[PDB]
Amino acid sequence: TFEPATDSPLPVPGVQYFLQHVQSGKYVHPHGGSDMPGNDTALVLHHGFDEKRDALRWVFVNDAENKHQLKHYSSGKFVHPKGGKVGKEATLVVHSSPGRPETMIEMVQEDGRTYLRHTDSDYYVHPHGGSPNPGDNTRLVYYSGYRPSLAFLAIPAETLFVDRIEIHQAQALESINTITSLSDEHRNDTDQPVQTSISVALEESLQDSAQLSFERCFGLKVGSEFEVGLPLVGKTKVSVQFSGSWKSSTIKGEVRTSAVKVQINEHVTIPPGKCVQIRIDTRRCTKTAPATMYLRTASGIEVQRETTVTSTYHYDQEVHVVPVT
Ligand SMILES: CC(=O)N[C@@H]1[C@@H](O)[C@@H](O)[C@@H](CO)O[C@H]1O
């Protein structure tokens, strides 16, 4: 299963998220839930959720213009300490004023969980009163230190398009192997040559597969199925069709074009008194590489996600009639 505390993805800057306090399940809203909250309106936790509500959406900003800020998607307001100083019980509020070093806020990983933290400080984001299950409309504050109960989950709140995945060629590992299948023995106990049907079923032996793996979870929404060209043996690209969920730590990939045969059917003239076998020799490329996924928002920002590509691919099949003596 997806374990929200141990699998929570780190948010990608410029992408829309919902913020969820893991322990309560409550979401981060401006107080009053407006899409146009006022200056010095508090961030609070509330059970309320509606995928379609833009006032629920937040965007992590980290660019030349703004370093380590959090933005309210519907209003464009940044998240500030109330009064302009991060300190004990300083309420998080939205405000139209641009961000500063003294307002920095980012999601960070500490001992396997994701937390909101004022950058370059020991201040993290707590629910006022520090309850593992705060009540609706509890305000979020800055406070020294962190503990599991404060963990947040950034849930992707828009669907991206996967443009391409680029293998890191220098750390790409390749293990080539020969899968050898022998049919049953067939013997010709007549006094004339018999042309005999010999079949072998190799569906489970020669199953092709591709996997994208992530330390926590993919953490992006990209649709039901997506297709990319992956180099499944040497540098030769093959079309792989992936389906998963943002919560997946492993996305399974299907190979469209099979390069070998999984049903072997040979017509073999067996001479009088002779025994034969079909020998199938199939090559398997077992591959692993770090890779960068390149994805696009509808708003047109290109974003990246590191992954590990793993694949089993079968090529260069040979069939031979071997004598059984
Ligand atoms: C020991 C303890 O839980 N203290 C918490 C403190 O850590 C912080 O979460 C604060 C925020 O208001 O609430 C307090 O109750």
UniProtKB/TrEMBL annotation:
Binding positions for N-acetyl-alpha-D-galactosamine 2 per the UniProt entry: H80, G83, S97, R100
Residues annotated as binding N-acetyl-alpha-D-galactosamine 1: H29, G32, R53
Entry binding sites for N-acetyl-D-galactosamine: H80, P81, G83, E89, S97, R100, G129, R147
SUPFAM superfamilies referenced in this protein's UniProt entry, alphabetically: Aerolisin/ETX pore-forming domain, Ricin B-like lectins
Sequence positions that bind N-acetyl-alpha-D-galactosamine 3: H126, G129, R147
InterPro entries in the record: Ricin_B-like_lectins
Name under which the protein is recorded: Uncharacterized protein
The species this protein was found in: Salpingoeca rosetta (strain ATCC 50818 / BSB-021)
